[PDB]
Design a protein around this ligand. Sequence first.
Ligand SMILES: *[C@@H]1O[C@H](CO)[C@@H](O[C@@H]2O[C@H](CO)[C@@H](O[C@@H]3O[C@H](CO)[C@@H](O)[C@H](O[C@H]4O[C@H](CO)[C@@H](O)[C@H](O)[C@@H]4O[C@H]4O[C@H](CO)[C@@H](O)[C@H](O)[C@@H]4O)[C@@H]3O)[C@H](O)[C@H]2NC(C)=O)[C@H](O)[C@H]1NC(C)=O
Ligand SMILES: *[C@@H]1O[C@H](CO)[C@@H](O[C@@H]2O[C@H](CO)[C@@H](O[C@@H]3O[C@H](CO)[C@@H](O)[C@H](O)[C@@H]3O)[C@H](O)[C@H]2NC(C)=O)[C@H](O)[C@H]1NC(C)=O
Ligand SMILES: *[C@@H]1O[C@H](CO)[C@@H](O[C@@H]2O[C@H](CO)[C@@H](O[C@@H]3O[C@H](CO)[C@@H](O)[C@H](O)[C@@H]3O)[C@H](O)[C@H]2NC(C)=O)[C@H](O)[C@H]1NC(C)=O
Ligand SMILES: *[C@@H]1O[C@H](CO)[C@@H](O[C@@H]2O[C@H](CO)[C@@H](O[C@@H]3O[C@H](CO)[C@@H](O)[C@H](O)[C@@H]3O)[C@H](O)[C@H]2NC(C)=O)[C@H](O)[C@H]1NC(C)=O
Ligand SMILES: *[C@@H]1O[C@H](CO)[C@@H](O[C@@H]2O[C@H](CO)[C@@H](O)[C@H](O)[C@H]2NC(C)=O)[C@H](O)[C@H]1NC(C)=O
Ligand SMILES: *[C@@H]1O[C@H](CO)[C@@H](O[C@@H]2O[C@H](CO)[C@@H](O)[C@H](O)[C@H]2NC(C)=O)[C@H](O)[C@H]1NC(C)=O
Ligand SMILES: *[C@@H]1O[C@H](CO)[C@@H](O[C@@H]2O[C@H](CO)[C@@H](O)[C@H](O)[C@H]2NC(C)=O)[C@H](O)[C@H]1NC(C)=O
Ligand SMILES: *[C@@H]1O[C@H](CO)[C@@H](O[C@@H]2O[C@H](CO)[C@@H](O)[C@H](O)[C@H]2NC(C)=O)[C@H](O)[C@H]1NC(C)=O
Ligand SMILES: *[C@@H]1O[C@H](CO)[C@@H](O[C@@H]2O[C@H](CO)[C@@H](O)[C@H](O)[C@H]2NC(C)=O)[C@H](O)[C@H]1NC(C)=O
Ligand SMILES: *[C@@H]1O[C@H](CO)[C@@H](O)[C@H](O)[C@H]1NC(C)=O
Ligand SMILES: *[C@@H]1O[C@H](CO)[C@@H](O)[C@H](O)[C@H]1NC(C)=O
Ligand SMILES: *[C@@H]1O[C@H](CO)[C@@H](O)[C@H](O)[C@H]1NC(C)=O
Ligand SMILES: *[C@@H]1O[C@H](CO)[C@@H](O)[C@H](O)[C@H]1NC(C)=O
Ligand SMILES: *[C@@H]1O[C@H](CO)[C@@H](O)[C@H](O)[C@H]1NC(C)=O
Ligand SMILES: [Cl-]
Ligand SMILES: [Cl-]
Ligand SMILES: [Cu+2]
Ligand SMILES: [Cu+2]
Ligand SMILES: [Cu+2]
Ligand SMILES: [Cu+2]
Ligand SMILES: [Cu+2]
Ligand SMILES: [Cu+2]
Ligand SMILES: [Cu+2]
Ligand SMILES: [Cu+2]
Lengths: 559, 559
Amino acid sequence: EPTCNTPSNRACWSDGFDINTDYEVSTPDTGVTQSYVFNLTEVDNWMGPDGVVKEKVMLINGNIMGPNIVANWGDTVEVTVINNLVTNGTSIHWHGIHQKDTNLHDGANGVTECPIPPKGGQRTYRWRARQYGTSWYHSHFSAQYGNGVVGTIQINGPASLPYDIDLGVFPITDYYYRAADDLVHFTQNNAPPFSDNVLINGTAVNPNTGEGQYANVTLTPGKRHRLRILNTSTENHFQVSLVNHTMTVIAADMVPVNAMTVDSLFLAVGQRYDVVIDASRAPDNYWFNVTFGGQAACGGSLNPHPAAIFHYAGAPGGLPTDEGTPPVDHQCLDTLDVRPVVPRSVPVNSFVKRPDNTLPVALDLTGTPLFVWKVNGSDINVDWGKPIIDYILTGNTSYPVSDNIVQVDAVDQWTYWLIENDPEGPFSLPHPMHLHGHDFLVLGRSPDVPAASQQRFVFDPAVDLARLNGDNPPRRDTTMLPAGGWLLLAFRTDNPGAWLFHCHIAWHVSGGLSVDFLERPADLRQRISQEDEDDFNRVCDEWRAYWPTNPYPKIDSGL
Amino acid sequence: EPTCNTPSNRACWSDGFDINTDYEVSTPDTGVTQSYVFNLTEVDNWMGPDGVVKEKVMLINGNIMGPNIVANWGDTVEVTVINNLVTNGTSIHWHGIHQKDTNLHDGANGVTECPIPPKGGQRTYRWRARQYGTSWYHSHFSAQYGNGVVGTIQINGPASLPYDIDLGVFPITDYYYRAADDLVHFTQNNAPPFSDNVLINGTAVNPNTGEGQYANVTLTPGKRHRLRILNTSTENHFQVSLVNHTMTVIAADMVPVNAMTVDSLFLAVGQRYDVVIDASRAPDNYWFNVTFGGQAACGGSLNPHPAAIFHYAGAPGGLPTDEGTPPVDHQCLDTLDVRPVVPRSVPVNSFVKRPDNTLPVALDLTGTPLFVWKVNGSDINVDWGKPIIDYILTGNTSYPVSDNIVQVDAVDQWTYWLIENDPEGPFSLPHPMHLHGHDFLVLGRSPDVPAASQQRFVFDPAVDLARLNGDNPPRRDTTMLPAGGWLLLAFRTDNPGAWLFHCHIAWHVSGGLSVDFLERPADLRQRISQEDEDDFNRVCDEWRAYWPTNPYPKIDSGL
Ligand SMILES: *[C@@H]1O[C@H](CO)[C@@H](O[C@@H]2O[C@H](CO)[C@@H](O[C@@H]3O[C@H](CO)[C@@H](O)[C@H](O[C@H]4O[C@H](CO)[C@@H](O)[C@H](O)[C@@H]4O[C@H]4O[C@H](CO)[C@@H](O)[C@H](O)[C@@H]4O)[C@@H]3O)[C@H](O)[C@H]2NC(C)=O)[C@H](O)[C@H]1NC(C)=O
Ligand SMILES: *[C@@H]1O[C@H](CO)[C@@H](O[C@@H]2O[C@H](CO)[C@@H](O[C@@H]3O[C@H](CO)[C@@H](O)[C@H](O)[C@@H]3O)[C@H](O)[C@H]2NC(C)=O)[C@H](O)[C@H]1NC(C)=O
Ligand SMILES: *[C@@H]1O[C@H](CO)[C@@H](O[C@@H]2O[C@H](CO)[C@@H](O[C@@H]3O[C@H](CO)[C@@H](O)[C@H](O)[C@@H]3O)[C@H](O)[C@H]2NC(C)=O)[C@H](O)[C@H]1NC(C)=O
Ligand SMILES: *[C@@H]1O[C@H](CO)[C@@H](O[C@@H]2O[C@H](CO)[C@@H](O[C@@H]3O[C@H](CO)[C@@H](O)[C@H](O)[C@@H]3O)[C@H](O)[C@H]2NC(C)=O)[C@H](O)[C@H]1NC(C)=O
Ligand SMILES: *[C@@H]1O[C@H](CO)[C@@H](O[C@@H]2O[C@H](CO)[C@@H](O)[C@H](O)[C@H]2NC(C)=O)[C@H](O)[C@H]1NC(C)=O
Ligand SMILES: *[C@@H]1O[C@H](CO)[C@@H](O[C@@H]2O[C@H](CO)[C@@H](O)[C@H](O)[C@H]2NC(C)=O)[C@H](O)[C@H]1NC(C)=O
Ligand SMILES: *[C@@H]1O[C@H](CO)[C@@H](O[C@@H]2O[C@H](CO)[C@@H](O)[C@H](O)[C@H]2NC(C)=O)[C@H](O)[C@H]1NC(C)=O
Ligand SMILES: *[C@@H]1O[C@H](CO)[C@@H](O[C@@H]2O[C@H](CO)[C@@H](O)[C@H](O)[C@H]2NC(C)=O)[C@H](O)[C@H]1NC(C)=O
Ligand SMILES: *[C@@H]1O[C@H](CO)[C@@H](O[C@@H]2O[C@H](CO)[C@@H](O)[C@H](O)[C@H]2NC(C)=O)[C@H](O)[C@H]1NC(C)=O
Ligand SMILES: *[C@@H]1O[C@H](CO)[C@@H](O)[C@H](O)[C@H]1NC(C)=O
Ligand SMILES: *[C@@H]1O[C@H](CO)[C@@H](O)[C@H](O)[C@H]1NC(C)=O
Ligand SMILES: *[C@@H]1O[C@H](CO)[C@@H](O)[C@H](O)[C@H]1NC(C)=O
Ligand SMILES: *[C@@H]1O[C@H](CO)[C@@H](O)[C@H](O)[C@H]1NC(C)=O
Ligand SMILES: *[C@@H]1O[C@H](CO)[C@@H](O)[C@H](O)[C@H]1NC(C)=O
Ligand SMILES: [Cl-]
Ligand SMILES: [Cl-]
Ligand SMILES: [Cu+2]
Ligand SMILES: [Cu+2]
Ligand SMILES: [Cu+2]
Ligand SMILES: [Cu+2]
Ligand SMILES: [Cu+2]
Ligand SMILES: [Cu+2]
Ligand SMILES: [Cu+2]
Ligand SMILES: [Cu+2]
């Protein structure tokens, strides 16, 4: 609970806790628990917000998204998940929540848990809110979250700029009328489709019939508003802009940053930005536009102009009349100019590229299906019925090859990872790379060029070491791997666990594009509670008894 | 020679000849010959117009392009081509020139001729100017024209609007520092690169160093100016626009059309537009911009803003200061709104799709090399040493499968052709389809959608017959096959000959994307002069004696 957080002093939170506190190591002891119950149901012939009826959706508590989780910094969040789907298992992953020494609550089926079985299976997740900001949750059962198993997280805390009004969450997502498993099957042998629409806070107008509604945000004239923008898509990467207004970034993913004013923002799949908008212009209706850059390399929509309305209170109703001007083309790249308020410093001069720190991503066209994504030679394929944690608990280290285990034994040390984007393959695409368990430092990447330009880079210390930044670089949980290029990340091994590191485009992680960092496994078994072990085994027993009765095969990685 | 063509009466040409004459069946008898000698040489370490030195170019008469061919409607054009290259043969094709009963002058090596051998081989081309407008010529020896064996054609004649000043040709082309054979090898296993620059009338500024110069067109205030725009690229498809001005189209390719005013134009590879520009704006310097649309599906450049300067005479010098707005995205599609002045009408209600009128284009990823283009099951591969005309002249009908012969025996009848763009393949690209020997009618295509949107269409008469237009549809020699869709063309079999029909992206026709319409072969032997037969055999005997001594393999289709 805050005691000094006010509009003119958002930096303050409570005694001992403010925007400069190192939240990764110091957490308020609030003693409070915020609990939720998620009931997952399978609904056929569901009428969506743009008027089109979808063949099948998978909903939390009967709505297009699950409830907005809300707690304070230092609370515990507890979610009972009850799976009333017909056939699918489910696992809910709390994206952006590092699960420090709570790996078994990460929701990564086949890694940290077996899936909760359908027809009434249940599990309760419990995690500490050791960060504040905007995050989200979604299924990790193959591409299930593309059917509706998704929602937002708002953990309140201090901020890097004063503001008057917290407008809350503003999730933006691609929207397909086809169901997720159908799209996974499709994308195994075909380029992915443009989205049928882009929803903004759950709604959009159908570009074809005019049904639906624009999201409508009311601004209080003369006031400073925090807007928590998310990209919860399965594939689309968005540019956002508000006509005639700038946006001031105060957080990137769940990491507060020094204020940074921009005219438009690029959000990768899974990224968030907290921004402050000053209602400083003439009272009117303004469009908030979603646009695409990068010559389609990171998505498009068949709605040519997805948008929301920002309405100044007291102004007329109606649609905005100024179409504004297109934002700069971000070329499928997030900005590396953000700077965390709580800094990190690491050396970059000593980096040496070696097989054991290099993750080559490659598209393999030579087998079945046609599009298979491999990392270091292997497409990931997890066993929902024998998760990596089961190996840890039984002392078996014979991990299957397709689990893509990258064992990291270093204890609370910075580890450096060079990811290479198929520079030798016939073509390469942008990928939004996401790490569970940690925020990474973005130490650098290949030179920024047009996403569709086919220019290729391989890391060369002679020119690239000097392009690296270890002086408080961007710190976040998702960033872009440039098409044709490379990306150098670092993270500190402060959290024993099995942690996925994967592309967040559903079609690609389905297709194999992940590894699993097995961090300090010799420390992990000691740190697993009896309750967590017992409940892991309970759910896996139920899952393993269920699975042979399932009528459908698993057709992808499981993730 | 014209006798009545004046600025206020451009429709008039001479007694019995004007813009309404059916130029396809009636030609002025001028008895005049315009002759040229083309000396092809191989130049290493050539300094190009944006200051970059290229490894190797292949030039006509020592310049970046060959001579601008100029003649009057009904003259004869004669060109002696002397091949002083070091290893390559060469064949010069007169794009847009129908070669009515002169097939052996079409310059299609492997089809209508063997290549002229290097180290001094020569051949004289001779053809009647039976069409007036703007065309171009280029080698057809694999992708050689990408090295500089290219130039323009201006056949003067009447026009569909009055105008004061003919500004002449304005060829726009992609420009690569790598040589064409290296790019063919690259694109056999890699997506094609963005161009390094785009030249306009021979010049551009280097986007990185500032070297070079902008093309500079001086407009006479208050006058109407004809501008003959061409896209002579190997791959890039361009959008063009002049800031603050419209352009009025008066011809498409070599076909005069009713005046059509637009803000911007799409030119596929090989297309031309003649436009009239009225210098009616305030005297100033204005940018002529080259832009790309279609999310890079039909090209890009590493110069983000290739441009020319249109200067009003009498105004200050220096650079335009108005950057203007970006044009509408043409989505890699040419406009089907043009209407020829001399009309054609054909029935479309009676079309029925059948194997023998359908040309399925497919990318085959299963062979060597990776990217092989097939039409009706076969990637074309011609024999430079045994052209299809050799078979005609020796009474041999055993055409190889790889010559992709589509024999058309109908005499002077409309023939209808449905081209299908790999609609069941994993992905599909726009292709600029070009027919030798004829203008075709563009009867229809699949619905216009964004080029990268992945939307696929297969011809369905229940919806698509009503979408066809046989009442004076666009008539021209190049038009777009939409990504994922289909195109329906017709042409009348008025010209016995072996006629290539192919994608004009160099990398794709090298990769197999062509067929060869063998039109009225039973009429064609009868129509070949002894002189043409004897010279065909002479050049082939020289080419066959040369070829075993060549140090390089043929690595593509030969076209
Ligand atoms: C791209 O670069 C190339 C090379 O640098 C430029 O090519 C020049 O192109 C122009 C136009 O084609 C050409 O000039 C014409 O040459 C013709 C042959 O000599 C002339 O007959 C013609 O004169 C007519 O037009 C003039 C104005 O353009 C008039 O002043 C002149 O009186 C003639 O016009 C009267 O006569 C004609 C009948 O011929 C009649 O139809 C008219 O109505 C009128 O009564 C031009 O002089 C140059 O010779 C080419 N120069 C080069 C170096 O080769 C090209 O222009 C550049 N493109 C752009 C658009 O800038
Ligand atoms: C999770 O639940 C969903 C929804 O029921 C399951 O998706 C369904 O999966 C089946 C089996 O893969 C899909 O059908 C198959 O489709 C292909 C071709 O399209 C066909 O070849 C097969 O014979 C079969 O018909 C079905 O379309 C799909 N339905 C939806 C709406 O997506 C999914 O299988 C479940 N997953 C698990 C692991 O149980
Ligand atoms: C921000 O989003 C708004 C709302 O979607 C966009 O407005 C839309 O702008 C398009 C393009 O200008 C308008 O469309 C067109 O209409 C004309 C005829 O009026 C037609 O000539 C065009 O070909 C075209 O289809 C559309 O009317 C307008 N929609 C509404 C409801 O106003 C706006 O463009 C977006 N701006 C940015 C910078 O992305
Ligand atoms: C027409 O003349 C050009 C220019 O000399 C010849 O192009 C050259 O072709 C050779 C043979 O394909 C190229 O070298 C080869 O390169 C590949 C891959 O880069 C390599 O695997 C080979 O072992 C060999 O070195 C060469 O780079 C290329 N040069 C240029 C400037 O393009 C072409 O072969 C001639 N065509 C005919 C049919 O004679
Ligand atoms: C967006 O929501 C706002 C706020 O509720 C709507 O604003 C009202 O609009 C009507 C006229 O349509 C006015 O009578 C009210 O006084 C407005 N209230 C506010 C506080 O200003 C607005 O109409 C909505 N816009 C859209 C298109 O639905
Ligand atoms: C990528 O796979 C390569 C090949 O298996 C791995 O390189 C082996 O790694 C072990 C342990 O570091 C070394 O002792 C061997 O010498 C390596 N062999 C080769 C071929 O170099 C590499 O470690 C894997 N990379 C990651 C990040 O998992
Ligand atoms: C484009 O070419 C025109 C025509 O030669 C140039 O215009 C001359 O420009 C100088 C100043 O540089 C003037 O003093 C003359 O009066 C202009 N003559 C005409 C007839 O107007 C123009 O400068 C060139 N632009 C650039 C970018 O090179
Ligand atoms: C027309 O081409 C001009 C010249 O290249 C473009 O002007 C450039 O505009 C960009 C974008 O703002 C600037 O960064 C450069 O400074 C401009 N160049 C210089 C020499 O002026 C212009 O953007 C193009 N216009 C359109 C609509 O594409
Ligand atoms: C595409 O190839 C197909 C297969 O060879 C050709 O189809 C045949 O056409 C002949 C006569 O022209 C018929 O006798 C056959 O019944 C067709 N075979 C089958 C499988 O349909 C077709 O003509 C070729 N199309 C073109 C335009 O070349
Ligand atoms: C889940 O929701 C459904 C549909 O409203 C309801 O039938 C079911 O009883 C709920 N189950 C649980 C335990 O909430
Ligand atoms: C938005 O900004 C542009 C540039 O200043 C201006 O022309 C326009 O009038 C502004 N809109 C409103 C609502 O004032
Ligand atoms: C260890 O796990 C592997 C791979 O899943 C399995 O083959 C083996 O039987 C296990 N060993 C025992 C001791 O459980
Ligand atoms: C071709 O041009 C070259 C280069 O200038 C010249 O040396 C040669 O004599 C010319 N040959 C012919 C026949 O014109
Ligand atoms: C057709 O040409 C081929 C290839 O040169 C030759 O082998 C064959 O004998 C010729 N057949 C006829 C009938 O002349
Ligand atoms: Cl996470
Ligand atoms: Cl032609
Ligand atoms: Cu996630
Ligand atoms: Cu995550
Ligand atoms: Cu990816
Ligand atoms: Cu994940
Ligand atoms: Cu051509
Ligand atoms: Cu041609
Ligand atoms: Cu093509
Ligand atoms: Cu051709």
